[PDB]
Amino acid sequence: DNLIYNAEEVNGVVVSETIFKMEGTMLTNYMKHNYKYDANNQRTEDEAQKWNSNKNRWENNLCIRYTYGNKSMTTEYYKWNSKKKEYILVPEMTVTMD
Numbered sequence: 810d811n812l813i814y815n816a817e818e819v820n821g822v823v824v825s826e827t828i829f830k831m832e833g834t835m836l837t838n839y840m841k842h843n844y845k846y847d848a849n850n851q852r853t854e855d856e857a858q859k860w861n862s863n864k865n866r867w868e869n870n871l872c873i874r875y876t877y878g879n880k881s882m883t884t885e886y887y888k889w890n891s892k893k894k895e896y897i898l899v900p901e902m903t904v905t906m907d
Contacts, residue, residue, distance in 0.1 A: 812839070822846055841867055851877060872896045881905055 813836060817825040825843050829836040838860035845854040857871040869889035876883040883905045887896040 822850060837862070838867075847877075851875070869896065881907055 811830060813829045813831055815827045815829075816823045817827075823844060825841065827838070828840040828842075830839050831837070840860065841858045843854070843856040843858070844852055847853050853875055855873045855875075856869070857873075858867040859870045860866075861868045871889070872887040874885045874887065876885070883903065886899050886902045888899055889895070890897050
């Protein structure tokens with residue numbers, strides 16, 4: 810609710826979206842979602858980056874991946890690890906619904 814959105818569109822689909830906080834008129838970066846789609850144009854990733862003002866950069870955090878079965882979508886959640894420099898799966902949180 811204290812948040813402001815700007816979306817980047819390419820060929821009808823949002824490839825990215827940026828979320829800011831606003832002190833008055835000045836916007837300050839907060840989170841950035843980078844999205845990927847398949848050929849059928851359904852969403853496949855949703856990488857969630859956080860703004861680290863003090864290092865002044867976008868830092869990898871969470872990433873969700875969607876899989877479409879014929880009766881079922883499966884969503885898997887990954888967390889970024891610095892020391893490995895990889896998005897690691899948290900299978901504990903995986904969900905499968907119809």
